[PDB]
Amino acid sequence: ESQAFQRQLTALIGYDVTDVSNVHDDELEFTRRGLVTPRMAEVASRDPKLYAMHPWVTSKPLPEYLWKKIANNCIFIVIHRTTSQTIKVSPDDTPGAILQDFVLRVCGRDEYLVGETPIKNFQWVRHCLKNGEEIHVVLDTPPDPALDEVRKVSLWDCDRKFRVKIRGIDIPVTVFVEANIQHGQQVLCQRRTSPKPFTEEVLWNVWLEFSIKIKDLPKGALLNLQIYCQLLYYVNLLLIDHRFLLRRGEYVLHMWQISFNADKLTSATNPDKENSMSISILLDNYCHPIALPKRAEMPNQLRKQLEAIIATDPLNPLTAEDKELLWHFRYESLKHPKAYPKLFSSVKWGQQEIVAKTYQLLARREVWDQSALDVGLTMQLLDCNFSDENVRAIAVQKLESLEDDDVLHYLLQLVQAVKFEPYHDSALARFLLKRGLRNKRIGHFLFWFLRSEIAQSRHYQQRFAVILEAYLRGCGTAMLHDFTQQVQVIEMLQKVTLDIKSLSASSQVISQLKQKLENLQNLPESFRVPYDPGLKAGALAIEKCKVMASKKKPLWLEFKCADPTALSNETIGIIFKHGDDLRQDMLILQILRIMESIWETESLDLCLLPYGCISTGDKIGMIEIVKDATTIAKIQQKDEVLNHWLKEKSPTEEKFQAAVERFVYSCAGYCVATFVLGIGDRHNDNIMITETGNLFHIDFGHERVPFVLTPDFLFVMGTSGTSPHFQKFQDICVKAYLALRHHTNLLIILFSMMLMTGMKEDIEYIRDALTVGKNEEDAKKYFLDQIEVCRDKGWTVQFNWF
Numbered sequence: 001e002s003q004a005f006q007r008q009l010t011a012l013i014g015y016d017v018t019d020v021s022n023v024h025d026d027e028l029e030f031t032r033r034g035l036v037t038p039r040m041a042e043v044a045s046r047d048p049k050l051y052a053m054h055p056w057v058t059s060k061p062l063p064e065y066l067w068k069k070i071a072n073n074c075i076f077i078v079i080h081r082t083t084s085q086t087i088k089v090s091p092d093d094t095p096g097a098i099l100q101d102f103v104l105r106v107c108g109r110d111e112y113l114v115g116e117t118p119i120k121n122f123q124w125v126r127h128c129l130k131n132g133e134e135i136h137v138v139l140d141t142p143p144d145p146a147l148d149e150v151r152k153v154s155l156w157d158c159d160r161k162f163r164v165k166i167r168g169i170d171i172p173v174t175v176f177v178e179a180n181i182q183h184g185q186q187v188l189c190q191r192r193t194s195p196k197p198f199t200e201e202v203l204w205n206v207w208l209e210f211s212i213k214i215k216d217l218p219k220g221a222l223l224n225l226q227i228y229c230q231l232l233y234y235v236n237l238l239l240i241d242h243r244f245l246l247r248r249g250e251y252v253l254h255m256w257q258i259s260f261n262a263d264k265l266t267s268a269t270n271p272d273k274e275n276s277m278s279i280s281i282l283l284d285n286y287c288h289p290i291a292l293p294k295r296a297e298m299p300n301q302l303r304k305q306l307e308a309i310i311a312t313d314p315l316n317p318l319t320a321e322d323k324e325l326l327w328h329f330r331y332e333s334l335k336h337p338k339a340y341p342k343l344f345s346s347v348k349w350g351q352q353e354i355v356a357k358t359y360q361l362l363a364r365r366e367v368w369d370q371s372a373l374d375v376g377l378t379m380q381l382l383d384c385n386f387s388d389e390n391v392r393a394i395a396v397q398k399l400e401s402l403e404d405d406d407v408l409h410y411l412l413q414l415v416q417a418v419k420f421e422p423y424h425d426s427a428l429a430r431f432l433l434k435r436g437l438r439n440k441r442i443g444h445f446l447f448w449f450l451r452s453e454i455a456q457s458r459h460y461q462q463r464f465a466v467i468l469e470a471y472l473r474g475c476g477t478a479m480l481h482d483f484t485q486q487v488q489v490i491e492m493l494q495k496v497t498l499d500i501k502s503l504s505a506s507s508q509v510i511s512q513l514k515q516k517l518e519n520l521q522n523l524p525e526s527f528r529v530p531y532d533p534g535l536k537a538g539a540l541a542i543e544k545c546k547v548m549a550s551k552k553k554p555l556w557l558e559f560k561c562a563d564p565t566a567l568s569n570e571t572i573g574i575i576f577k578h579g580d581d582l583r584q585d586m587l588i589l590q591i592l593r594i595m596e597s598i599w600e601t602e603s604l605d606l607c608l609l610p611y612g613c614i615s616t617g618d619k620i621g622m623i624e625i626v627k628d629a630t631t632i633a634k635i636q637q638k639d640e641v642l643n644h645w646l647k648e649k650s651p652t653e654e655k656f657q658a659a660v661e662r663f664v665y666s667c668a669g670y671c672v673a674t675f676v677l678g679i680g681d682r683h684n685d686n687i688m689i690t691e692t693g694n695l696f697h698i699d700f701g702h703e704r705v706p707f708v709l710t711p712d713f714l715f716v717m718g719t720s721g722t723s724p725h726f727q728k729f730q731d732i733c734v735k736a737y738l739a740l741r742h743h744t745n746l747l748i749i750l751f752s753m754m755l756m757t758g759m760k761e762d763i764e765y766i767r768d769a770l771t772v773g774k775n776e777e778d779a780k781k782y783f784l785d786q787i788e789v790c791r792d793k794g795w796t797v798q799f800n801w802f
């Protein structure tokens with residue numbers, strides 16, 4: 001009756017929030033309760049007119065390469081209604097001024113040109129100008145905002161030393177327990193139990209007295225229990241709870257097994273109980289509830305020493321002297337926003353006094369607030385190394401400066417960063433709740449970015465599910481309708497992918513596929529595309545649908561577009577795959593999209609193709625089909641072969657000369673990008689190219705060479721084992737490489753988090769690849785040398801690949 005809505009949300013999320021069986025406290029229920037207010041606040045504050053039409057706009061400057069297309073200076077936008085007419089408009093002209101009521105929707109898209117924004121500052125206008133396409137719009141009627149209607153004793157006096165009683169470890173099928181007090185990645189104090197023979201049950205009943213006191217336990221503290229026999233099981237328990245109270249009583253904790261990592265920081269217990277390892281522990285209880293309460297300059301030499309510490313890379317660890325230097329002169333270090341991550345590492349979190357000294361130091365934020373926004377440091381303070389609620393919130397406060405365009409560039413990386421938050425309700429989760437609820441595009445990607453983890457991560461599904469339910473409860477009836485239509489389709493397409501895979505390691509398979517898709521089309525008739533929400537896919541082209549030939553078996557699906565106002569009847573091609581982890585490809589594609597923005601600021605377009613890719617469920621998702629594209633393997637199935645393929649598929653010579661240029665930029669782009677990320681040693685079948693000349697890597701799901709610059713690519717430029725194109729390539733390569741190096745800290749910390757949340761020494765790769773330390777001229781030469789490593793090898797490495 002009154003519960004029907006929750007069972008609808010339950011099916012959208014893919015996990016039950018009301019079901020509380022793997023919970024030892026009430027944090028999820030308390031954060032479900034606490035999340036109501038920032039949803040109520042956002043639902044109410046959003047302009048219902050601009051919420052319904054979600055104009056995807058930017059406040060960033062129009063790039064160098066895009067002002068080349070505009071001349072007079074005017075742009076042509078063709079308005080449709082059967083009868084169409086072109087209108088010459090100034091780049092700085094508002095959409096209403098063009099209209100001279102009615103709205104300017106994009107043809108075949110739920111994309112609109114609205115608000116007090118210049119047309120040059122629209123993401124669809126910039127997109128068309130980049131791709132050299134016409135701006136086809138339609139004089140449509142604004143959508144009803146009615147469709148989005150939303151349904152409605154003190155701690156610092158407990159000077160006693162802390163202790164935990166290790167009762168034992170009950171397991172269904174030598175060993176010792178390692179008890180740790182943790183804050184960030186920094187272990188405060190360790191204690192082990194005496195080794196005992198490994199059996200079905202191992203009792204100890206011994207108390208482990210720690211060096212740290214109750215008073216000195218920081219908000220965010222963790223009792224991390226580990227089972228060593230060398231590490232085999234782990235579990236965590238927040239010593240300070242959500243209601244600021246120290247943990248008391250008996251706790252049985254089901255432990256996570258093994259095979260550093262974000263999964264190893266989780267406060268959640270293992271849901272499996274009949275097969276998992278447990279741990280009975282006792283925590284000292286009291287009659288009254290224990291509750292946590294709330295100059296000189298610097299000499300020229302010690303200034304230079306501190307300046308060198310700030311200027312180093314994030315991965316560079318601080319010594320004991322570096323930590324003392326930074327802490328003593330914290331008031332100076334506070335006047336340099338770049339020192340904050342390193343300074344907040346230098347503080348002794350296991351000392352109530354040193355913590356209180358930081359908390360009051362942070363009240364002098366006049367300098368941090370007034371600073372120019374840096375995503376680098378903001379992401380730095382949100383990682384595993386920072387467990388303090390206050391420090392993290394200073395980073396979340398800067399995320400408010402980010403306009404909807406930028407929130408989209410880091411939505412996935414911010415969603416992952418929630419894994420490092422000690423408590424469920426956090427400034428970050430709330431931040432992602434505001435931005436998702438304010439914007440429909442952000443909200444759509446939020447849904448899928450959260451649903452990605454809820455369905456595959458047993459470690460963080462609990463936390464993420466309460467954040468999804470909170471977003472869902474405020475998006476409005478329209479988005480809730482759209483998501484049911486997406487869930488219903490992917491859940492339908494999930495069975496088909498799995499049933500077909502359970503028939504192969506042919507005509508039988510291809511007939512059985514259409515035999516199943518037939519009893520599927522007879523709901524829904526339309527659904528938004530999870531990786532491109534503007535595009536609405538209609539009914540299937542069941543005759544075009546096939547099962548793909550590789551080691552894995554994906555579903556090549558083609559859907560007609562639901563919008564009849566579309567320019568072409570070109571179907572929407574979607575790959576539905578199983579057995580591969582799309583969570584890592586999502587992460588790689590995101591850094592690629594970030595790299596492009598870095599190049600945009602530096603006035604460069606390296607023509608990357610970061611194809612839509614959404615992780616949907618348990619090792620299953622969907623991938624965008626790139627139209628008129630094939631792999632290098634299919635083009636070979638040597639030197640001449642690619643340039644012969646480009647001319648052959650090219651209509652005019654004008655278009656071919658465009659095809660070789662689109663090749664040099666995209667090739668240089670994938671050369672710099674895949675090198676930095678360390679995914680350049682890839683097989684020919686994992687490198688694609690459009691009939692337009694647009695090259696792009698794929699299958700990112702986890703002798704040597706730095707990148708792929710084979711002779712067939714070189715022959716396209718006009719070189720065999722210099723050229724006017726190869727010189728243009730080398731120059732744009734360096735120009736692109738040096739741009740990414742200006743954002744070292746950003747890339748370093750983006751990669752670091754990517755590793756921990758998606759997948760110590762492995763991370764160190766970007767230090768060397770982004771040539772940390774070396775000057776602008778030394779890096780130019782270093783990259784040009786890596787070009788020559790590909791020239792020397794040629795077909796060697798490509799041949800080596802089995």
Ligand SMILES: Cn1c(=O)n(C2CCOCC2)c2c3cc(-c4cccnc4)ccc3ncc21
Nearest residue numbers: 548575611623624625626629630631698699700
């Ligand atoms: C025409 N055509 C293909 O043949 N294929 C492939 C199918 C699987 O064998 C490799 C080639 C693709 C595409 C494959 C991906 C992709 C698939 C899995 C992982 N990462 C990326 C993306 C876009 C694509 N577009 C077009 C297209």
